[PDB]
Amino acid sequence: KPQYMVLVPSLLHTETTEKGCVLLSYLNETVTVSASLESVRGNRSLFTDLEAENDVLHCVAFAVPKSSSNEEVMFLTVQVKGPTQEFKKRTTVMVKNEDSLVFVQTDKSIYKPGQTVKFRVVSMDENFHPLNELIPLVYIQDPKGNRIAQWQSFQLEGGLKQFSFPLSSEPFQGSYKVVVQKKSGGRTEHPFTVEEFVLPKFEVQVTVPKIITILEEEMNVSVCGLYTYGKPVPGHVTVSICRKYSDASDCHGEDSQAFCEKFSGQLNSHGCFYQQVKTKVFQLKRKEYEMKLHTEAQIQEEGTVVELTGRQSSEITRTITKLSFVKVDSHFRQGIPFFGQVRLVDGKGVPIPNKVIFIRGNEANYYSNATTDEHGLVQFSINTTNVMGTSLTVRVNYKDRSPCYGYQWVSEEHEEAHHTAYLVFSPSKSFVHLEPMSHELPCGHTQTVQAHYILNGGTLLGLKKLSFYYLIMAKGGIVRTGTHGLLVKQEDMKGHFSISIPVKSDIAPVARLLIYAVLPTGDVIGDSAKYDVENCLANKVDLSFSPSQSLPASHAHLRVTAAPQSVCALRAVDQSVLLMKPDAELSASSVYNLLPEKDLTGFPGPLNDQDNEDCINRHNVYINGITYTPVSSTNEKDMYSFLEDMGLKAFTNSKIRKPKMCPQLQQYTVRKYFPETWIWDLVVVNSAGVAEVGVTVPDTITEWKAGAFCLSEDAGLGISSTASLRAFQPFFVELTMPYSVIRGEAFTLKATVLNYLPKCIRVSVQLEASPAFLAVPVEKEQAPHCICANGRQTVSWAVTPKSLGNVNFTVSAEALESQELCGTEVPSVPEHGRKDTVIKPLLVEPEGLEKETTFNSLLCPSGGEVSEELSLKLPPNVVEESARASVSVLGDILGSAMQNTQNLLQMPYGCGEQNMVLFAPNIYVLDYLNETQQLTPEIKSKAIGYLNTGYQRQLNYKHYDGSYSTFGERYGRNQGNTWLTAFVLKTFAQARAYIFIDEAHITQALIWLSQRQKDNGCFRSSGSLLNNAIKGGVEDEVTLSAYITIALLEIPLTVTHPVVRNALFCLESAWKTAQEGDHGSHVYTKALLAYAFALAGNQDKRKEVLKSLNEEAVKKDNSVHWERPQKPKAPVGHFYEPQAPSAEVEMTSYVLLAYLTAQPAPTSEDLTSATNIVKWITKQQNAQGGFSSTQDTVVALHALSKYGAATFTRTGKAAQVTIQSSGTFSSKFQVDNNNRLLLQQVSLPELPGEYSMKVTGEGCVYLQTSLKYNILPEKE
């Protein structure tokens, strides 16, 4: 027959080539294979085309561009235009606008203040020949839901960029994030840190099992670690040993920690420290959980704590005698030998010699026995001619937890070797098996493999011989293309053939091979494979260096060898504090897995398969036998499935799809230089390798690490690894100390000077004290006899600072001559710079207690200019040279309102209550996202869908009269709900306010609440709730009625006629009842009065109540907020204080909400307190979306939205600024729509703040000013 097979990796990755391979054979070489790649809706077409000869394989390396949308279904139709035969056949395929991988490697582990945060970032297309491409943004978010620095709107030219941002000496601390987004919305992170601490002069490490098991009475554990140049250190050791989850309550004075022993020790002078244990006391049993530990040790004369949390997730297991398979034979067939190596180990992880097994196969009803080789390896073999389902089993003991499994309270198990193999569906009666090398793979190498084939009747007619074809695949692409054959026998089923195929690079970290043959008879077979192609790079690369150096040995170098025209990441670190805490996600494996679509494998979610309409539904099948028998649905292996496993696709009419019938439905010398960076730069490799000239740092002996990454178009990327270069000085003075003291308070410093070489020498350290401190010793009059190797005796001291900032400290040692008293001799001839005088850094504060000193003031030019002056001036009991203050300048809607805003975007299921919770709040965030101006008409239109469906499903649960309950239909006789219906009228208001509604709904519901009116009273809930929290309130008609008046006065573009004023009337009534008293929870009811009177505009009355609230202040240290008693007069419950939603973000919003209201404008005091209480809002939000109810979420989002609707207008993006202080020290600023929110962290030199504001232009701004200044001169 005419035969063609057309192999295509089944996602279409853009901005790089697309190499799908293709075959022809046996008929019509005058043919034009062509993959037409069309988005028929409208009309795209990225035609692919090629011509070739019969019985050869070739590959068209076309490509794809950016697209209509991101990720899209693609019906790629292949066309093969022969001279006498036509053909046409479609499919479905996928294309995603390439969404790259980018990242950051921050400088170091753990940072001090005062430093330039420098970093980089990368991106590549699928062919990792990297890709210079435009960049939307390059910034950092400050921990508090805010930003501190930025780069923006550049593009890579070297495929890279490096940065810098000198941090202050008194900035914030904690966690930090250089966050970055890719233009199509995709954004992600690389967090990091800056804290304060004191440095290490070493690191050490545990010895311990990561795996202790059941049958254990002790634990091989010890303490072995490094030092300066990996040397020996003297000191003292200690473990933190502990089990988890004993019977204590972890509460009420109790701890979840289970057993915990105690083992300290001395530090030996050679090697490492060893302390082992017992493990009976621990009760390694049913419900005493895994072991979690640390171990920490001192270095003498320096007093160090060394915490490390590791070797922690250990396997105190249940299964012992844990064997496994290694060499599976994935499939079983009736005409083949399959026989897989099977090792066996367990537990600790080394095999026994010569331990027995038990062998079993079923239906093949096999039975046998074996024992272990050196590693248990056995290559058992079976004969096959049996029913369609294999199910194997092998043991050395029996099927049960034999001791005591019928007691439920044990700690044990044992394995069961389990493996399933399915069979080819081969009407050909031919197939292939392999002998793969299914274990560790060498690259830059190659290894030969055999495999085992067969031929049903050989060439039935066919022709003489065949070639067998294979694709070496990569990343759901194609790295290579190959084939091989040889002369056959005439009609025979041979099996011998070998293959070795290249392992250089250019391929994914799988060798997901399949080698397949095919015939002229509408027939095809091939055998998939899979391997761990361990890490291999298109350009391997390393760093190195001529051997390491000593303390003043400033001379240094590099040796990196990569692609010959190529740019790179080249770091180098004083790895003291990066051997303290690690880096994270940094290796060639990082470069790999950071790839999205690591193993592009199998059809994803959206697509199922091709559907072929083979329906073999005979009425009776004529399955000829002693009793007839109908059709069925199998479960066996297929070749369709081989390629679906592989991932790629083709377009052919061979024998692949089984005749699986269609469902019937049934039938009827040392100079200290700055550490904190040794390298981070770019030297570029020429055609003989690069050579950076590093330069070593003196006056500190510590550890070193190479941060690395590389790039170029020519050779593909690469990964080097760690240079480490630990310094050393045969005579060094080492000054150690705490880090956290102040000029106010004294402290001490213990400077040791060591010896490690065979001469023992008299030596006395000294200092050259300063005015910045005041240093005089404790035992200098002592005559230090001498120090031998690791000889270190250390006199005491005491000292305080006086100077402020990045001050330094000095000691000095020097070996001494001609005092032969202690040792056998004292020549004392180290190098010409024998004397070590090491100056080391430190950062001090001014004495005592800096405190909180802040204010909220704010203004907004509306067609004009607003300005202010104000005092940051209160020096009572001030001390010299300590105060330091600041404002910071930006707007207040983009700070931390990305996550929640785009998150809470939802779709309907449930009864009227949660039906509304899933419908309504989407409207407030719709407005909130639109008001910010960072929206999209797609979320909009799919939100039209949201709104229609959710609206309609609200009507699923409403009343036949107009009203609304939770249930509605099928419950005819009923009455709706009051607070519910208030919410529904409110949100009907706003939802019409965005899109079309019908007027009758608001009509009939507004008048429902209107008739909810007998003579006088303030009505209550018609209690039919299913949930007391959906209404955050506390059930009093007070705040209910106040909900009515606000929700019925906010009146967007409709009318609110009768119902709402008498709500104001009862509101005044309850106000009389309350304010005539003094307690209504003191925040909640009267704040609702505030916002009720506000959207009413009872100006004196709203003012009185919100002003009482202003007296009843619960404000925040950086903001404002209000709280119900929090120790409530009635007794409270246990879990979240039930029966009481606590309604803070709803009430505090309803506190926030009174101020913004005035139909022209309120005061700017309202805007100040608003951004205060909204700092509190956004801080009171959590990572999911919304807040702890639906009420608080709705009303928060709306408060925020209309705060904006006040402060936001499209063309109003022109807010200009100045300060005006008389000390020639002021500042001009500007704020707009596109420089719309950069924080301007800015400080001031004057003790007082007499800095007169000015603000002109369009749009409002949020500033926040405060001071830190120390106190406490004497306080006798």
Ligand X SMILES: *[C@@H]1O[C@H](CO)[C@@H](O)[C@H](O)[C@H]1NC(C)=O
Ligand Y SMILES: *[C@@H]1O[C@H](CO)[C@@H](O[C@@H]2O[C@H](CO)[C@@H](O)[C@H](O)[C@H]2NC(C)=O)[C@H](O)[C@H]1NC(C)=O
Ligand Z SMILES: *[C@@H]1O[C@H](CO)[C@@H](O[C@@H]2O[C@H](CO)[C@@H](O[C@@H]3O[C@H](CO)[C@@H](O)[C@H](O)[C@@H]3O)[C@H](O)[C@H]2NC(C)=O)[C@H](O)[C@H]1NC(C)=O
Measured at the CA of 560, the angle between CA 558 and CA 565, to 5 degrees, comes to 125
Q: Which tokens sit at 724?
A: 């480490």
Q: 751 — phi, psi (to 5°)?
A: -90, 110
Least distance to ligand Y, CB of residue 803, Å: 7
Phi, psi (5° rounding) for residue 32?
A: -130, 85
Least spacing, CB of residue 1018 vs a copy of itself, in Å: 6
1001: left (phi over 0), alpha (psi -120 to 50) or beta: alpha
Contact status: 1129 vs a copy of itself (CB under 8 A):
no
Return the number of the residue (288 or 699) whose C-beta is nearest ligand Y: 699
| Max intra-chain CA distance, the chain | 117
Distance between CA 228 and CA 204 in Å, rounded? 10
Q: Are 1158 and 1102 in contact (CB under 8 A)?
A: no
Q: How far is the CB of 524 from ligand X (least distance, A)?
A: 17
Of residues 723-762, which lie at the interface with ligand X (CB under 6 A)?
Answer: none
Is residue 806 within the footprint of ligand Y (CB under 6 A)? yes
Distance from C-alpha of 226 to C-alpha of 240, rounded to nearest angstrom: 19
Rounded CA-CA distance 44/60 in Å is: 20
| Contact flag: residue 1018 with a copy of itself (CB under 8 A) | yes
- The reply to whether 368 sits near ligand X by the rule CB under 6 A is yes
Binding-site size, ligand Z (CB under 6 A): 4
Q: Does 934 bind ligand Z (CB under 6 A)?
A: no
As a residue count, the chain comes to 1276
**Minimum CB separation from ligand Z for residue 988, in Å?**
17
Kindly state the DSSP code that residue 672 receives in the 8-state scheme.
-
Distances (CA, A) of 766 to 237, 377, 751, 813, 814: 30, 67, 9, 6, 9
Distance between CA atoms of residues 151 and 143, nearest Å: 18
What burial letters (b/e) apply to 760-769, b meaning 16+ CB within 10 Å?
Answer: bbbbbbbbee
Query: Which residues in 9-28 contact ligand X (CB under 6 A)?
Result: 27-28
Which residues, at least 6 apart from 1059, have a Cβ–Cβ distance to it below 8 Å? 1006, 1007, 1009, 1010, 1044, 1048
CB of 47: closest distance to ligand Z in angstroms?
41
CB-based contacts of 1008, cutoff 8 Å, min separation 6: 961, 962, 963, 976, 981
249 binds a copy of itself (CB under 8 A): no
Residue from 192, 282, 468, 651 touching a copy of itself (CB under 8 A): that is 651
Q: Which does 931 bind (CB under 5 to 8 A by kind): ligand Z, ligand X, ligand Y, none?
A: ligand Z
Partner whose binding site includes residue 538, from ligand Y, ligand Z, a copy of itself, none (CB under 5 to 8 Å by kind): none
In the chain, the amino acid numbered 332 is: F
* Candidate list 132, 620, 686, 1073; residue touching a copy of itself; CB under 8 A: 620
Which lies closer to ligand Y via its Cβ, residue 657 or residue 672?
672
Local structure of residue 1256 (DSSP, 8 states): E
Binding segment (CB under 6 A) for ligand Y, from list 147-155, 800-808, 928-936, 1085-1093: 800-808
Binding mask 1030-1069 for a copy of itself (x = CB under 8 A): -------x--------------------------------
Q: How many angstroms separate the CA atoms of 479 and 451, rounded?
A: 22
CB 939 within 8 A of CB 928: no
Q: Name which position in 17, 36, 677, 1054 contacts ligand X (CB under 6 A).
A: 36
Which of 67, 240, 930, 974: binder of ligand Z (CB under 6 A)? 930
C-alpha closest to that of 434 among 419, 447, 448, 453: 453
> In the bound complex, what is the minimum distance in angstroms from residue 395's beta carbon to ligand X?
12
- Contact call for residues 474 and 498 (beta carbons, < 8 A): no
Which 3 state secondary structure label does DSSP give 1258?
strand
930 binds, among ligand Z, ligand X, ligand Y, none (CB under 5 to 8 A by kind): ligand Z
Q: Which does 619 bind (CB under 5 to 8 A by kind): a copy of itself, ligand Y, ligand X, none?
A: a copy of itself
Classify each residue of 796-832 as buried b or exposed e, where b means 16 or more C-beta atoms within 10 Å of its C-beta.
ebebbbeebeebebbbbbbbeeeeeeebeebebebee
From residue 422 to residue 461, the character string flagging contacts with ligand Z as x (rule: CB under 6 A) and all else as - is ----------------------------------------
CA 1080 to chain centre: 46
Question: How many residues interact with ligand X (rule CB under 6 A)?
Answer: 22
Verify binding: residue 653, a copy of itself, rule CB under 8 A. yes
Q: For residue 319, which of 215, 210, 413 has the smallest C-alpha distance? A: 413
* Tokens describing residue 1034: 């506390």
Reference 1033, options 925, 1145, 912; nearest CA is 1145
Instruction: Report the residue number, 217 or 1015, with the smaller CB distance to ligand X.
Output: 217
To ligand Z, the closest distance from the beta carbon of 589 in angstroms equals: 47
Burial bucket for residue 127 (CB in 10 Å: 0-12, 13-18, 19+): buried
- Sole binder of ligand X in the list 41, 43, 852, 996 (CB under 6 A): 43
Using CB under 6 A as the binding rule, the residues of this chain from 106 to 135 that contact ligand X are none
Rounded distance between C-alpha atoms, residue 953 and residue 911, angstroms: 8
Q: 646: which 2 tokens?
A: 């592989």
Contact 1197, 928 (CB under 8 A): yes
Joined tokens for residue 1172: 């205060």
291/751 with CB nearer ligand Y:
751
Quote the least distance from Cβ 905 to ligand X, whole Å: 35
Nearest approach in angstroms of CB 1201 to ligand Z is 7
Q: Which stretch binds a copy of itself (CB under 8 A): 420-428, 576-584, 786-794, 1009-1017?
A: 1009-1017
224 part of the interface to ligand X, by CB under 6 A: no
Least gap, CB of 1 to ligand X (angstroms): 7
Q: Is 215 in the site for ligand X (CB under 6 A)?
A: no
By the rule CB under 6 A, 927 interacts with ligand Z: yes
**What CA–CA distance (Å, rounded) separates 972 from 980?**
18
Q: Which is nearer to a copy of itself, 491 or 614 (CB)?
A: 614
Whichever of 699 and 931 has its CB closer to ligand Z, that residue is 931
- By CB under 8 A, is residue 355 in contact with a copy of itself? no
Tell me the residue type at 975. Answer: Q
The residue among 452 and 1020 lying less far from a copy of itself, judged by its C-beta, is 1020
Compose the 814-843 pattern: x for residues touching ligand Y by CB under 6 A, - for all others: -------------------------x----
Q: Which lies closer to ligand Z via its Cβ, residue 186 or residue 1212? A: 1212
964 belongs to the binding site for a copy of itself (CB under 8 A): no
Is 807 an interacting residue with respect to ligand Y (CB under 6 A)?
A: yes
> What residues line the site for ligand Y (CB under 6 A)?
672, 806-808, 839
> What residues line the site for ligand X (CB under 6 A)?
2, 27-28, 36, 38, 40, 43, 45, 82-85, 218, 220, 337, 356-358, 367-369, 383
> What residues line the site for ligand Z (CB under 6 A)?
927, 930-931, 1210
> What residues line the site for a copy of itself (CB under 8 A)?
362-363, 365, 613, 615, 618-620, 622, 640, 649-653, 657, 1013-1020, 1037
